[PDB]
Every structure is written in structure tokens, then in C-alpha cells.
Design an enzyme around this catalytic site. Sequence first.
Site, mmCIF file in Angstrom:
data_model
loop_
_atom_site.group_PDB
_atom_site.id
_atom_site.type_symbol
_atom_site.label_atom_id
_atom_site.label_comp_id
_atom_site.label_asym_id
_atom_site.label_seq_id
_atom_site.Cartn_x
_atom_site.Cartn_y
_atom_site.Cartn_z
ATOM 1 N N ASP A 1 0.636 0.927 -8.153
ATOM 2 C CA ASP A 1 0.993 -0.515 -8.115
ATOM 3 C C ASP A 1 1.241 -0.980 -9.550
ATOM 4 O OD1 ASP A 1 -0.013 -3.574 -7.881
ATOM 5 O OD2 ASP A 1 0.902 -2.936 -5.990
ATOM 6 N N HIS B 1 0.266 0.921 1.545
ATOM 7 C CA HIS B 1 0.394 0.850 0.092
ATOM 8 C C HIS B 1 -0.771 1.513 -0.640
ATOM 9 C CE1 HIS B 1 1.751 -0.701 -3.707
ATOM 10 N NE2 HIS B 1 0.721 -1.514 -3.864
#
Lengths: 296, 297
Positions: free
Chosen positions: A107, A277
Site C-alpha cells: 500500500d 488488499h
Amino acid sequence: LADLFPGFGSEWINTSSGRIFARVGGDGPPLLLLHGFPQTHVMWHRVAPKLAERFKVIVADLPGYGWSDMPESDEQHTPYTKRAMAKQLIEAMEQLGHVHFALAGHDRGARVSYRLALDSPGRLSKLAVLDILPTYEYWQRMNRAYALKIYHWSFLAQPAPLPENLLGGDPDFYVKAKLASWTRAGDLSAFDPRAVEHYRIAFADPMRRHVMCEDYRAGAYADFEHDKIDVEAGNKIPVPMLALWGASGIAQSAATPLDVWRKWASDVQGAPIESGHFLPEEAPDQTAEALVRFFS
Amino acid sequence: DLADLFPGFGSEWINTSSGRIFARVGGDGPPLLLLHGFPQTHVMWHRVAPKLAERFKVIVADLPGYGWSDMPESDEQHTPYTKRAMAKQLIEAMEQLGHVHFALAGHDRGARVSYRLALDSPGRLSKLAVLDILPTYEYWQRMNRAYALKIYHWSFLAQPAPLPENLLGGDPDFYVKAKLASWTRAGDLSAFDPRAVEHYRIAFADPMRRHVMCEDYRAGAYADFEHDKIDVEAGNKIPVPMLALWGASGIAQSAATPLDVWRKWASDVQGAPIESGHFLPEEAPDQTAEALVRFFS
């Protein structure tokens, strides 16, 4: 707050831009792991012990996140641009004698990682980025479908104090919403509740929230510009790189990730992981195996 | 206490099959319906409606779900807050007053009701004016980094409930004042009447009203966009004579002018920039009023 890295040491690393907090364990070649939003270093807690059997694992809070110090920002969001974050973590690693190291980021930390590899490629032996495409690629793919899916890219980049004022009414709701929304299952079941508490405590500090918005402001402005220069100048990452992404993650929602990264990197290999994610928490063994194999 | 900003206008509650529409009504002559948008209410017309009411029967309506109009129950497709459904409801409301053929000016969300009304039911309109918008399809088709940052609320307010509702609840007074100020040329609240701001602030204070606004934007991301796409694809144009006004620093303007866009959507459109931000009838009331009286007369 729980200790999720049993047997890992703790380090407070001074840099010119403030202290970097990290857990450190293992032995062997140095491997820096960087988290992203809205998390802290503890997102690695399921993968780092596996990695520590083969590497010296440095699990750092990004500048401004977790327990790292929060440099004061400015009108160009400079300390929270990935270029500045990369430079600060390079200094941090130099403080430990690590001038050449491997790096895996997730991320925001993956954005620090590829910018570090573009700016200072000689610092990296190998690089792994988890569930991202470059910031440029997201913005260049910002159509109606993608603007709705990653609305927070444009919401959090609104001028202060608009996002900060909205987040401040119920911070707990927003951090749990973001953690839940991006997982495969769409709830919090993939996370260790002790890890969630870490993320929730960090998000409960208004200065921490401001830093996250500054990160996203940098992401909309300077980070995009830095990336734009490199892509338009044909600059590629020369470091061998691994791109991992979640079958149900963010990166795959706007493109085929390996195809994108091959435009940015001269030597890139890639794999999907059945996951949302948050690969190291949703698919810890799968992620750990991919990382151990790549960095070995 | 809320100021009466339309001295000499009546107040009507207009029944429809979806709920009541609140309106101020003044003047005499041909009927002209004025529709506000977000985050406002009908009172945004308070500086221009008196000049219009010199020549028209002016009906200043709260949009369904907004202001003092009733809030129809939404559904998973946000149907009552689609511009198609709002237009149908306002048509019904005007019918209750005996107006089956009327002039219409809309701003912001109300302008989106207005051009959808013109596409769906052009026989109901004599003339149409839209203030500081492009069609919903055009905004989403233009979607890029620049537009995403500028009209971020189009994707933020369209997130699934309760995410925007919960965030708006975090500081509603700040949010509505921030939207008002940031879209003006001045960048502050000095263009507005403080009594009008109070109307907007009070309406925005109600969580149910805020939810309606999110339902409106959700419609704007989904059904409204699909309805517009069908017209683009089918080549349907608005056949009602139309005026497009926009702010020099409003919303609709980029370096490509709203008039060129609207000519793709309308067969007879004239247009003019107004030295204003987004809130033309409040930032630039004399210029807006003149343009509208000239067009509608």
C-alpha cells in the site's frame, strides 16, 4: 497494545526528519518491510516471523505513522511525499549499517518502495510491492468506475481541514470501514483483533489522521508529478522486483498488474494471491512463501 | 428563527403521489419554476426571484427530499432521487397548480432535474435555463485526476451508506459552509446573505436530509448516468430553447466552454459566462437575473 512480534527487538531510529520506529528480528540479509494505510508495522505480524528465519527483518512504521515521529508538513506535503519518505528510510537504514537491502512494501509503503527504487536504485538488492500500481497509473485510470472504487484517493487529498474535520467525528468507524471494505470477505475477520486495536489506536490520534491526509495529498500532487516525470522520461526500476497483488485487491481493479509494472520495471515477476488488499494478513502463508522464495 | 427572504411571496405545500413539494410563489404572468441544488434550498433564489416575479408567476420549489419538501423513501436504486423521478414529481406538482407548460431554470442538482425533464417530457417546457452544469454523463465521461480532485464529492457522496452519512455527521456545519465557500469566486461566505446561509445550515443539520443528498448523488453516479447514456447513444437532443449560464470560476467550466458541450445535447442553446463562482444567483444576482429575464421574455 499487544506485542505481535514475540522475540523481535524494538528500535527507535533517529533521522534528520524524525525517529522511525521499528521491530527488528531474525538474522541474515537485511529486509525492510513497510506497511501502508490505515495500518502500522504490525500488519506484518503473521509474515515477519517466517521471514526472520532467513533474513534480518526490519518492520518499520512509515514516517508519520504508528510510532514514528510526525515531521511537520508544509504546503507541498513534502515530508509525506514518497520521495521524502524514501530518503528518510534510507537514512534510517544507514543508521543500522544497511546501505544495500531488500525491501517489501504494502500500500503506501509499496509506493515509498518503488519511489525509493527509482530515486536510489543502488540501495536495493531486490524489491517486492504488494497490491499496488504506481500512483501515476491510478490517476491515469481515474474514470467513473475507478473514482467510485478508490474515492478516498480524492477525498483524503482535499485541502485541510476538510477530510480531517469529517474523520474526527467518529474515527473508529472510518478505520474499521477501510480495513473491512478492502478485504476479500468485506469484514474484519481476516485481521488479528490485537492488530486491529493497533490500527484503531493509531487512527484515534488527530495528528496521525492529519499525516495520513498529507500522505494522500502528496499522492494526488507531488507523488503524481514525480511519477509522471519518470514515466514520461522512460525511467524504469532496474532492481529485480516482485509484484504481488490480491485477486480481489485494489491494483487489479484498474488494470492487469504485471502488464503495468513491466512498463515501470525492467525485471519484474508477478503473482496473484487469492486475497483482498491486505495480503500479509488475509493470505499470510501464501504471501510469506512468495516473499521467502523471491528474496532467497 | 428562519428569515422570510421572499417578502410578498406566498408559501405553498404542493401534494404529489411521492410527497409534498414546498414552494414560495409570487408574481403573475407565465409560470416559471426555479429549482435549487446542493447544498442549498429554494432560498438561494432570493435575490433573483423578485426581479423575475415582475414578469412571471415564479414558483421557487424545494427539490423532493430537500429543504421543506417531503422525503420519499428511497430504495436500492435510489429511484425517488434520480433526476427522472424528481422531474416526474415536479411535473405532478406543477399540474396541481394547473401549469402543464412552463418555463424552468435550475441550478446545480435542480439543473440536472431540469435537463432530464426536458429530455423526458419536452412538451412541458416553454424554455429551459441551466446554471453552471454540464450533463451528468459529461462529468463522468470527463472523469480524470483533475476532475476527481475538483468534484470529489461526486464519488464521495455516492459511496454506499452509511459511509458518507457517518462522515458528514462528523462536522455538518463545517461541511456545508465549506461547500458554499469553496465554490464561490471569493472563497468565503461573503457572497451569501447570512440569513440564506442559516437556511442552508439548518437543512444540512438534519441527518435525514443529509441522507437524501447522498441518495441524490448515488443516483447521480448510477441511474442518472445510465439515463443520460441512453440519450447520448440514441442521439436524443433537447428541443426546448435553452440557456446555459455558467460561472467564470463555477463548476461546468474548463478550457472547452459549457456551450460547446450543451450544443451536443440541445438543438437550440445560447449561453454566457457570468463573473461568478458556482452560485450564480447569489454571487452575481443582477447579471443572472438580467440574463434570465431577457431569455425568458
